[PDB]
Design a binder for this molecule. Structure first.
Ligand SMILES: CCCCCCC/C=C\CCCCCC(=O)OC[C@@H](O)CO
Ligand SMILES: CCCCCCC/C=C\CCCCCC(=O)OC[C@@H](O)CO
Ligand SMILES: CCCCCCC/C=C\CCCCCC(=O)OC[C@@H](O)CO
Ligand SMILES: CCCCCCC/C=C\CCCCCC(=O)OC[C@@H](O)CO
Ligand SMILES: CCCCCCC/C=C\CCCCCC(=O)OC[C@@H](O)CO
Ligand SMILES: CCCCCCC/C=C\CCCCCC(=O)OC[C@@H](O)CO
Ligand SMILES: CCCCCCC/C=C\CCCCCC(=O)OC[C@@H](O)CO
Ligand SMILES: CCCCCCC/C=C\CCCCCC(=O)OC[C@@H](O)CO
Ligand SMILES: CCCCCCC/C=C\CCCCCC(=O)OC[C@@H](O)CO
Ligand SMILES: CCCCCCC/C=C\CCCCCC(=O)OC[C@@H](O)CO
Ligand SMILES: CCCCCCC/C=C\CCCCCC(=O)OC[C@@H](O)CO
Ligand SMILES: CCCCCCC/C=C\CCCCCC(=O)OC[C@@H](O)CO
Ligand SMILES: CCCCCCC/C=C\CCCCCC(=O)OC[C@@H](O)CO
Ligand SMILES: CCCCCCC/C=C\CCCCCC(=O)OC[C@@H](O)CO
Ligand SMILES: CCCCCCC/C=C\CCCCCC(=O)OC[C@@H](O)CO
Ligand SMILES: CCCCCCC/C=C\CCCCCC(=O)OC[C@@H](O)CO
Length: 448
């Protein structure tokens, strides 16, 4: 129908490709924690709920950390369009694995398939959106807003459809629905891409030169050997527990930025030095925002009297508030504060969302059930902070893609401190710590 919301026709294919990837990812994301609880509940999965909560966080962390390499692989080894397709195949296979009649045994294979596949697909689907606007186009900003709208839309309907299906039929039937969404995205992506997309991106745009293959091989091989060497030393010293492997990835996930930062601090260097508070602010915000899939999901199931609807539906509040807030903040910023002071306020709101959640337990006690409106207000606050941090954050800096992996890595340690006895302290303490750190950044907003 000629333009798609004024944008080139190929936005529709990419819009829907990622809408269905996000449907498959976030639909699984809404019921995976309850799935592990269920597997624990029947004795099939021998971990604590604290460990089940830490897996959700470190699972997310690796997915974002898989996304920093995906652009490289498609820009230099395979194509951008092949990375999205074959990434989608891996995400679909990851969900098929959980739909099969397995239990805990399938969990690792599903997690590893989706980590790799999302890493190939997620950065390069955004790359293909840029290829629609050849160069120096005003439409670019609008078309990415359309693309992101399909992202949030798929994240919004997925807990509704997949969560209700888990309620209706099994967990396995619900996971197959996630697999089917990715399949739908592949159909539209494949047949729709052939018609629209540039055949230039069937092939790497910056292919490896003859002399670059061997150093890259050495580099990737040295990384795997040392990583494999660490793992065998762990088991030798007796650190072979699942919580210990999560700590390895935690250390790995946080050391990558630290090493890049210490690297660049080794010519008006203080521009870099300026980014440390900005980066730390992004990590703590993403930590709180990514705990909604974990800590807030636990609260909804254990602590909210939600007996007339599936508890996983609370995951739809995150993209819903993004979609309601997003046209406003577009209007708001065309009619303005700095990038650092935007970060601090974002962490303040994020901290306000956790402070709000400390109130019901303090007032009513912890052995009962509270209104679902508490969680509704909590997500309203944290997504408010996302509007300030996210659209601005990429500009102030990818190394910013990594802030999400570190926040979830930190989460893999913190969420194990959450339970009913620790509820009010967890929310209040970490919620206050975020707001206070936002005050320090407002003080530090002077220097940049
Ligand atoms: C958590 C890691 C999962 C990785 C799954 C997707 C990537 C698969 C293989 C990675 C090898 C490619 C070489 C890595 C690399 O050199 O990246 C550097 C590049 O991103 C610099 O911007
Ligand atoms: C599996 C069955 C057939 C293999 C299809 C390979 C498609 C790889 C690919 O790059 O697709 C990109 C898509 O945009 C097609 O134009
Ligand atoms: C140097 C490469 C970094 C490592 C990236 C690949 C990490 C692969 C998997 C880790 C994802 C989180 C693991 C969660 C997990 O172990 O769950 C499976 C467990 O429940 C099976 O009983
Ligand atoms: C790509 C499309 C994926 C195709 C997967 C579709 C269906 C797979 C069947 C999964 C549901 C069957 C199942 O195991 O449920 C268990 C059931 O017996 C519990 O009542
Ligand atoms: C599962 C295969 C991926 C679905 C798809 O769209 O591929 C169709 C394409 O291979 C037709 O030639
Ligand atoms: C799945 C296999 C293990 C993962 C492969 C990791 C890739 C890292 C190093 C090998 C580079 C492979 C690409 C080689 C290549 O195509 O270079 C040839 C060059 O002349 C044209 O690009
Ligand atoms: C890939 C390397 C890190 C994977 C960590 C997950 C894992 O292997 O879990 C092992 C644990 O289930 C056995 O006790
Ligand atoms: C370089 C990597 C540095 C440290 C890797 C060790 C990971 C932490 C292992 C650990 O202490 O887990 C505790 C576990 O033993 C509890 O049973
Ligand atoms: C927005 C401004 C303030 C909201 C603070 C949270 C609401 C506190 C509150 O209403 O608690 C009492 C509640 O139980 C109503 O019965
Ligand atoms: C803009 C609206 C956001 C309003 C949220 C602000 C919430 C501020 C403070 C709530 C902290 C509650 C601290 C809980 C507490 O007092 O602990 C004692 C409690 O255990 C007594 O049973
Ligand atoms: C910004 C909007 C208003 C927010 C006000 C902050 C709410 C602070 C506290 C909520 C009521 C908690 C009362 C806790 C308390 O008094 O403990 C008493 C009792 O538990 C002694 O053990
Ligand atoms: C940013 C806006 C924050 C507003 C969120 C605060 C709204 C909280 C409650 C409003 C409805 C009152 C229900 C109180 C409640 O939780 O029920 C407790 C009751 O079951 C104890 O017997
Ligand atoms: C649009 C998709 C998001 C779905 C979110 C799930 C619904 C969230 C809030 C609706 C609750 C309205 C009040 C429900 C209610 O009856 O109150 C329970 C009672 O315990 C109040 O204390
Ligand atoms: C948002 C406004 C704060 C909500 C609130 O104070 O609760 C009032 C509620 O108890 C009415 O019954
Ligand atoms: C300035 C940057 C702030 C970085 C994080 C801020 C809060 C960090 C730590 C809070 C203390 C909690 C320590 C307890 C903990 O981490 O538990 C992990 C342990 O259970 C591993 O499973
Ligand atoms: C603790 C009881 C309530 C006190 C809260 C009142 C508001 C808190 C702090 C007020 C701002 C402190 C000074 C902030 C400031 O000087 O900013 C300057 C900075 O923007 C220069 O670039």
């Amino acid at each position: 129908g000629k333009t798609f919301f004024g944008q080139p026709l190929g936005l529709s294919t990419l819009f829907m490709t990622e809408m269905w990837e996000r449907f498959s990812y976030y639909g699984m994301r809404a019921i995976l924690l309850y799935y592990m609880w269920f597997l624990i509940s029947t004795g099939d999965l021998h971990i604590t709920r604290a460990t089940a909560a830490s897996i959700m966080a470190i699972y997310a962390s690796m997915v974002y950390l898989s996304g920093t390499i995906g652009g490289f692989v498609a820009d230099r080894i395979i194509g951008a369009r092949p990375a999205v397709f074959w990434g989608g195949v891996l995400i679909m296979l990851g969900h098929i694995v959980l739909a099969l009649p397995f239990g805990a045994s399938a969990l690792f294979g599903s997690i590893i398939l989706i980590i790799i596949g999302t890493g190939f697909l997620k950065p390069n689907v955004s790359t293909l959106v840029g290829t629609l606007y050849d160069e120096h186009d005003r439409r670019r900003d609008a078309g990415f807003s359309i693309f992101v709208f399909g992202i949030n839309l798929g994240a919004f309907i997925a807990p509704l459809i997949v969560g209700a299906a888990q309620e209706a039929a099994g967990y396995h039937v619900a996971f197959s629905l996630a697999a089917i969404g990715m399949f739908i995205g592949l159909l539209v992506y494949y047949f729709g891409g052939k018609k629209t997309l540039d055949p230039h991106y069937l092939r790497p745009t910056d292919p490896l030169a003859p002399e670059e293959v061997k150093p890259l091989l050495v580099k990737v091989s040295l990384a795997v050997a040392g990583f494999i060497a660490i793992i065998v030393v762990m088991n030798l010293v007796g650190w072979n527990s699942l919580p210990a492997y999560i700590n390895l990835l935690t250390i790995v996930a946080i050391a990558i930025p630290v090493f890049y930062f210490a690297w660049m601090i080794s010519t008006e260097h203080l521009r870099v030095v300026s980014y440390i508070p900005l980066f730390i602010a992004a990590v703590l915000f993403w930590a709180i925002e990514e705990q909604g899939s974990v800590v807030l999901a636990t609260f909804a199931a254990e602590r909210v009297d939600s007996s007339w609807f599936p508890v996983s539906w609370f995951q739809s509040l995150n993209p819903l508030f993004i979609m309601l807030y997003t046209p406003f903040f577009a209007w708001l910023w065309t009619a303005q504060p700095s990038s650092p002071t935007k970060f601090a306020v974002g962490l303040m709101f994020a901290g306000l969302s956790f402070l709000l959640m400390a109130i019901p337990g303090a007032l009513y006690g912890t052995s009962g059930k509270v209104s679902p409106l508490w969680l509704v207000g909590s997500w309203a606050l944290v997504i408010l902070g996302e509007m300030l941090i996210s659209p601005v954050g990429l500009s102030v800096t990818s190394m910013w893609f990594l802030s999400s992996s570190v926040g979830s890595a930190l989460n893999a340690q913190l969420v194990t401190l959450y339970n009913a006895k620790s509820e009010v302290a967890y929310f209040s303490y970490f919620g206050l710590g975020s707001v206070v750190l936002g005050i320090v950044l407002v003080f530090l907003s002077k220097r940049i």
